[PDB]
Design a protein around this ligand. Structure first.
Ligand SMILES: [Cl-]
Ligand SMILES: [Cl-]
Ligand SMILES: [Mg+2]
Ligand SMILES: [Mg+2]
Ligand SMILES: [Mg+2]
Ligand SMILES: [Mg+2]
Ligand SMILES: [Mg+2]
Ligand SMILES: [Mg+2]
Ligand SMILES: [Mg+2]
Ligand SMILES: [Mg+2]
Ligand SMILES: [Mg+2]
Ligand SMILES: [Mg+2]
Ligand SMILES: [Mg+2]
Ligand SMILES: [Mg+2]
Ligand SMILES: [Mg+2]
Ligand SMILES: [Mg+2]
Ligand SMILES: [Mg+2]
Ligand SMILES: [Mg+2]
Ligand SMILES: [Mg+2]
Ligand SMILES: [Mg+2]
Ligand SMILES: [Mg+2]
Ligand SMILES: [Mg+2]
Ligand code: NA
Ligand code: NA
Ligand code: NA
Ligand code: NA
Ligand code: NA
Ligand code: NA
Ligand code: NA
Ligand code: NA
Ligand code: NA
Ligand code: NA
Ligand code: NA
Ligand code: NA
Lengths: 46, 81, 7, 82, 143, 56
RNA sequence: CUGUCCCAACGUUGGGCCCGGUGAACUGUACAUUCCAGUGCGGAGUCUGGAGACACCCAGGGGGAAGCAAAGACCCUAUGG
RNA sequence: UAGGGAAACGUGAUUCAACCUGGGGCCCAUGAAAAGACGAGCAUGAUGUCCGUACCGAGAACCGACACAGGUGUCCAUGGCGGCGAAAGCCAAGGCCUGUCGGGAGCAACCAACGUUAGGGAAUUCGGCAAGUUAGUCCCGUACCUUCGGAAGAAGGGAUGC
RNA sequence: AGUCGGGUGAGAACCCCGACGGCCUAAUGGAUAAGGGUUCCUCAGCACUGCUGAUCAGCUGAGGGUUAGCCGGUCCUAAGU
RNA sequence: CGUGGAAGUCUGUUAGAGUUGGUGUCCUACAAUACCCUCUCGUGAUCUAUGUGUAGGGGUGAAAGGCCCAUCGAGUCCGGC
RNA sequence: UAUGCCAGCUGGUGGAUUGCUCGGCUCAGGCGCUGAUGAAGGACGUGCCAAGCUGCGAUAAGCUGUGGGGAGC
């Protein structure tokens, strides 16, 4: 498919939201990314 | 008011274009054109830009591969920052 | 619903 | 060390399209028994392998001469075609 | 050690199917440490990496048969599988023929042997399918 | 041809997409109308009383 | 024309069976080694009388549990659709 | 005296996809439009921004709740033998051993696919269901009927390699 | 549709090298549209996922990767909106 | 006799389309319609991609009450409730 | 005395029960419009390290003034 530039910025963003909860946020909060998404398993909008 | 140049895109492949083709790679504002990217780069580091290739990265930022004239030296411009 | 179960 | 004739008539008890594999086992079991060594310690030089697979995976010979030697600090035989 | 990565690189540098590149079994360790295309070409120059030769089916037995057949053998009823007109296209054949006949007739005319009219008369009979081959044509011409 | 699983294979057409106005993936890119907010059809926002119980 | 049949046989491959690993579901009021009879809301493993019955486990083909699965489509009824 | 090749770094021919250009035939069917190009020269210089570009494209990257035996468009239709063939079978190039659990028992009964069964030959069965028979090509030859087109590969007989 | 050697490793039937043996031939090869959306590459891993195992991976974590005056979009108009 | 090459023409697992029998395999499936063999069409009222139009008592229908996203003798969602 | 039945003991599985309340539910008083000076809502950004939430808007968890507050942040 041919993605537009906006579609891309979004796909981009979605990709970053897909990272882990930084190691330090764990210690800082004295101890889960509920928005983790697999390319195959899950499905993005658009 | 946005700025044209965000910061130097330093990575291995970025280093090569520098040590081997006198090219500097930047992360520039995605609303900026090659021409605007050229000027900015010149006025900022005081060099002569010959050509500028852009690309809209999967990081939501626009990467620009800037090639300097033979008068300027990438490795040197980069070293000062 | 069609004779033998369930044809 | 000695020269032995291994009968591979029992690989017929295995489905035909797989004789080769079974044959190759029969050999290890035979050497292991006749040399008083564990099947693990039986090294079959690739010569034997190619020998058994010569005519494809389903056409393995009914016999096969093989030269085996015995030795080392645990016991084990090395073997090859002849 | 996993040399699969290299295999992909070697296959491209040597420019051969991956299935052809050969890695010396005694130099896995080295090939392992090979990371860049350059590292590969070097191992190639060292002969550690090589490309097997690709075969081609042997047209030998074919040629022997081609001979026999050109000579007219090995073409009996028992060897024909296709229909008749399948083996030799009729229209095509008629083109071949009627053309040689018109070519012949055209020659005999310039050559003086035939008067425009004799030619005319013959040409029409040819296009009318009166002469089997050129031979049969000539034969008829000779009274 | 079953209307079930076998007819699922041809489903590769894109219709509903992230809407420019409301942000919902309800913008029908072929109709150029949002099924959610009504963008493309109505200046006002798509809203109905039946989206909740009568007394509420 | 032929294993469709008289009338079945042998064979081939994948299962089946044993071993390592992985590992569900259907179903379950309770009790439950049953069998022959009888009785009972007239179609009982459980009541009554007899008979039989040492426990546990493997494989099998499915006789019974009016087996499992589905609040009978037939039929009637409803001041139903 | 670009490039590429370790090297040689060919020449002719046949058949000829692509591509080019003609002729004929059909329609109670008539087979887009617009932008644009041409028409309308040459030199030198400048400018040519913006968006897409990874990868999969499927018996694991798509739809089907799944790493689903299903579904899903285009181009490669000119690789070799074969033969009528873009057919079978076999084999290159390329791909693969991931239609992804294995080990053991001559490996029983039973089941799935299937081979061969003497004599008989549809007696089976609602019914020849299932299976089987026939088969390619050439020659000879061909009934009733018929809307004269057909029936027709009727049927039947012969041939077949090296 | 594997087999014998061997490599790596705490651990190897299935991760890698070689040989032998095979499988795919309008496809199990090559290029792509839609669609997916980072699945691509690299390194480090095995708690999850993988019809067994795994040192392997489309899995986990971190980095990196897509460069156009002359390929597409962009322009034109089609049914039609 | 030849030429010509017509046809909702013939043979054909060319591609592609279809779906007659096995009432086979499957029937907690590979699969909420699959698998295998057999079978029909395959220059036309042909098959197919993409784009586009028709909307619910309304469409669409070479008509089977067929089809309108696993939903049809009146789709689906929410509301009346 | 194997397979095993019943009740208990120790450990587990499970998360009921009891206690607890940063949330709900309902009543009441006060108050009550925003937007082309571009609202409401949404997208995307924004942190040294930043996935979520909140805040904010390229001056991006903020900049200025006045008052309060105060030794912390
Ligand atoms: Cl012509
Ligand atoms: Cl493109
Ligand atoms: Mg670009
Ligand atoms: Mg009924
Ligand atoms: Mg003809
Ligand atoms: Mg339907
Ligand atoms: Mg009793
Ligand atoms: Mg009832
Ligand atoms: Mg009735
Ligand atoms: Mg690419
Ligand atoms: Mg798979
Ligand atoms: Mg017989
Ligand atoms: Mg009879
Ligand atoms: Mg009878
Ligand atoms: Mg039949
Ligand atoms: Mg990443
Ligand atoms: Mg690794
Ligand atoms: Mg990968
Ligand atoms: Mg026809
Ligand atoms: Mg046909
Ligand atoms: Mg359409
Ligand atoms: Mg009816
Ligand atoms: Na997805
Ligand atoms: Na950046
Ligand atoms: Na039989
Ligand atoms: Na039973
Ligand atoms: Na050929
Ligand atoms: Na495996
Ligand atoms: Na004629
Ligand atoms: Na069928
Ligand atoms: Na309706
Ligand atoms: Na309701
Ligand atoms: Na108020
Ligand atoms: Na954050």
């Amino acid at each position: 498919g041919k993605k537009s530039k906006a579609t891309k910025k979004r796909l981009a963003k979605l990709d970053n939201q897909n990272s882990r909860v930084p190691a330090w946020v764990m210690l800082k909060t004295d101890r889960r990314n509920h928005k983790r998404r697999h390319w195959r398993r899950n499905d993005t909008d658009e | 008011s946005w700025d044209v140049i965000k910061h130097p895109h330093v990575t291995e492949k970025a280093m090569n274009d520098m040590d081997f083709q006198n090219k500097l790679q930047f992360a520039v504002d995605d609303r900026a054109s090659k021409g605007e990217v050229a000027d900015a780069v010149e006025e900022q580091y005081d060099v002569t830009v010959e050509q500028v290739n852009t690309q809209n990265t999967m990081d939501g930022e626009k990467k620009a591969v800037v090639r300097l004239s033979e008068d300027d030296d990438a490795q040197e411009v980069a070293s000062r920052i | 619903x069609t004779x033998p179960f369930x044809x | 060390e000695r020269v032995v004739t291994i009968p591979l008539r029992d690989a017929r008890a295995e489905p035909n399209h797989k004789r080769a594999d079974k044959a190759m086992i029969l050999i290890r079991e035979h050497l292991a028994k006749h040399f008083s060594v564990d099947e693990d310690a039986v090294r079959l030089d690739p010569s034997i392998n190619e020998a058994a697979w010569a005519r494809g995976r389903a056409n393995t010979p009914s016999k096969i001469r093989v030269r085996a030697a015995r030795f080392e600090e645990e016991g084990e035989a090395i073997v090859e075609a002849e | 050690t996993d040399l699969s990565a290299q295999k992909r690189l070697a296959a491209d540098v040597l420019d051969v199917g991956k299935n052809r590149v050969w890695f010396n079994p005694e130099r896995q360790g080295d090939i392992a440490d090979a990371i860049t295309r350059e590292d590969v070409r070097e191992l190639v120059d060292e002969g550690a990496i090589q490309a097997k030769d690709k075969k081609g089916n042997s047209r030998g037995r074919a040629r022997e048969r081609q001979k026999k057949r050109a000579y007219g053998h090995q073409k009996g009823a028992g060897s024909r599988k296709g229909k008749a007109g399948a083996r030799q296209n009729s229209k095509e054949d008629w083109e071949s023929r009627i053309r040689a006949q018109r070519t012949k007739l055209r020659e005999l005319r310039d050559e003086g042997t035939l008067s425009s009219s004799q030619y005319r008369d013959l040409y029409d009979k040819a296009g009318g399918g009166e002469f089997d081959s050129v031979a049969d044509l000539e034969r008829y011409i000779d009274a | 041809t079953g209307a079930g699983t076998p007819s699922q294979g041809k489903k590769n057409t894109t219709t509903h997409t992230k809407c420019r106005r409301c942000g919902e993936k309800s913008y029908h890119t072929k109709k150029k109308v949002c099924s959610s907010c009504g963008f493309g059809k109505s200046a006002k926002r798509r809203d109905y009383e039946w989206q909740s119980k009568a007394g509420e």
